Specification:
Two copies of one chain form a homodimer.
Chain A lengths: L1 E4 L2 E4 L6 E5 L2 E2 L4 H4 L7 H17 L4 E4 L9 H11 L2 E3 L1 E3 L6 H4 L3 H14 L10 E5 L6 H17 L3 E4 L6 H12 L6 E3 L8 H9 L3 E4 L13 H7 L4 H13 L6 E3 L6 E2 L6 H8 L6 H12 L4 H16 L5
Helix pairs in contact in A: 2-3, 5-6, 6-7
The structure holds zinc ion (4 copies).
One zinc ion (ZN) binds next to loops of chain B.
PDB class: hydrolase
Keywords: Phosphotriesterase, hydrolase
Assembly: dimeric
Chain lengths: 329, 327
């Protein structure tokens, strides 16, 4: 009944209002240390993150889960610095996203399990900071390597009780294959969040996953390139569905009886080197509220659409607490 | 005038016997810091490196050029530590190899140039250690991104006088395209070494590059899977040609008049996370001399084949001094 944060162990009740899928910075391993001027400076990136998290805190956020892996250039010392300055708890992730270097892509299930367990049980790098979640990814049918990662992540979660959260291409229904592999491994679905599930309108796909016991990550609510259809890179990243369309899936899953199984987030960030240059000007145009978009815009939207307060609090406070608390079931 | 090393500037004459294409550790960016246990420990990797460099130093080596880039997991603090304990100069590299992550792959020629220039003119990470060479790579026909890396490398070289050195798939004569792209940016061939050129017996290919003024990197002389050909991953890394066969290309380019354009090395390492697990067990059986292989085995072999000591001196001392001097 402790959750590891970048500033150490917290009790479950200190987590409070939680954003389960976010990033301080979306980058690549070693990149922030090797070319900090890409973001202006390391301090400029940190200050920008602190401004954004302080705003999110003022709107009610107390914890974000940063699901940046090794290969997304997770820098836990940055995360501790930003956490302390903004007085927002940050949970760090182990696992791998879909840009693993050779030194990872050539590893066995056993080797990957050791690496994830290291980051949970011992610490990340030389920092003593322990991960509180495992992040994995597919983009369509799993590559052989991605299957090995799913299996290593299941093994790490069985050994530690730490949960797994996933990147999907929701248009390819990637959750069904991820689910199959987790269930062959023996991982309980209540320890798994199928992410980017708000990228699709296929409610049959989502209820069938929630029927099997999975948590459903509706985690990119503000992602929309509506108004910027002529920006190809921005439309490929954000899609042409509205924030309201995404948000209404939250209502839709409540209405199907699965309020218990929803996790809601922004999937935002304060820098993004692992995409096209200047993407942050597009993102900050699209959603100037940043990580404060869920509490400032989506919570009131869901209320005016009929969702009880009590339900929003189970989704933003109780679901995340239940999910993050280390347990096998 | 001055060459940058991981322990600061040295004068040209301090370089001495120089291995122009080596590695302390072949890895991936951030990997040694995130999982040092893959190598046993950071201490165990440093111990083995210090032992191998001291082995090389005893055989006459004074300087190595570690052509590990960002994406090969170059750790210049490790390089500094082993350089100092072994009393061997290490020149560090900028550039990109063929495992760039997205944060590099999506960058323009102009962005890449700024990055390379940072590592040459300011420093690597927060260390103040500056690169003395630019490493680039193709594996066959250049991808669009690798063409951008070659162009950024040429611009960084023209701005600083620092030389460029390449990875090739020699069986696809990559040096030909590399040379065209460099010349299109105005880079002089005398600032370029076309590497892994000993990976095939293709002297038409090598002499024509050398006739255009390129330096030819015969840099994998001890690489051979002969005797362990049934190990598929060893054979794919090391090839099925003997070290003597590779070394005879050195004699061949000398015989053709190109002694002034040859650079010889081992392309060795002491750890290797960017290949299959336990590869070091194979490598240490194939070439236990490590980075001492050139001075202990190749030099005497070439002497016995009639190459003069003065030609061996120009190749191992003079050619690297001229190549590394910023121009
Ligand atoms: Zn994702
Ligand atoms: Zn994300
Ligand atoms: Zn190479
Ligand atoms: Zn090499």
């Amino acid at each position: 009944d402790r959750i590891n944060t970048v500033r150490g162990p917290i009790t479950i009740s200190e987590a409070g209002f939680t954003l389960m899928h976010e990033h301080i910075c979306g980058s690549s391993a070693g990149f922030l240390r090797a070319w900090p001027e890409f973001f202006g400076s390391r301090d400029a990136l940190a200050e920008k993150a602190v401004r954004g998290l302080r705003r999110a805190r003022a709107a009610g956020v107390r914890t974000i889960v940063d699901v940046s892996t090794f290969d997304l250039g997770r820098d836990v010392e940055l995360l501790a610095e930003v956490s302390e300055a903004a007085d927002v708890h940050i949970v760090a992730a182990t696992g791998l996203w879909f840009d693993p270097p050779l030194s990872m892509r050539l590893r066995s299930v056993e080797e990957l399990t050791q690496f994830f367990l290291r980051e949970i049980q011992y610490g990340i790098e030389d920092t003593g900071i322990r991960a509180g979640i495992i992040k994995v990814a597919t983009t369509g049918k799993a590559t052989p390597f991605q299957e090995r990662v799913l299996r290593a992540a299941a093994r790490a979660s069985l050994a530690t009780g730490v949960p797994v959260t996933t990147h999907t291409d929701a248009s390819q229904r990637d959750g069904e294959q991820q689910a199959d592999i987790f269930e062959s491994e023996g991982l309980d679905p209540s320890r798994v969040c199928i992410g980017h599930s708000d990228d699709t309108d296929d409610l049959d796909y989502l209820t069938a996953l929630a029927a099997r016991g999975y948590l459903i990550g509706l985690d990119g609510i503000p992602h929309s390139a509506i108004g910027l259809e002529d920006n190809a890179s921005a439309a490929a990243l954000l899609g042409l569905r509205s924030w309201q369309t995404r948000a209404l899936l939250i209502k839709a899953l409540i209405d199907q009886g699965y309020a218990d199984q929803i996790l809601v987030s922004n999937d935002w960030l304060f820098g993004f080197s692992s995409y096209v240059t200047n993407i942050m000007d597009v993102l900050d145009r699209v959603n100037p509220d940043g990580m404060a978009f869920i509490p400032l815009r989506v919570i009131p939207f869901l209320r005016e659409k009929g969702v009880p307060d009590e339900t929003l609090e189970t989704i933003m406070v109780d679901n995340p607490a239940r999910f993050l608390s280390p347990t096998l079931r």
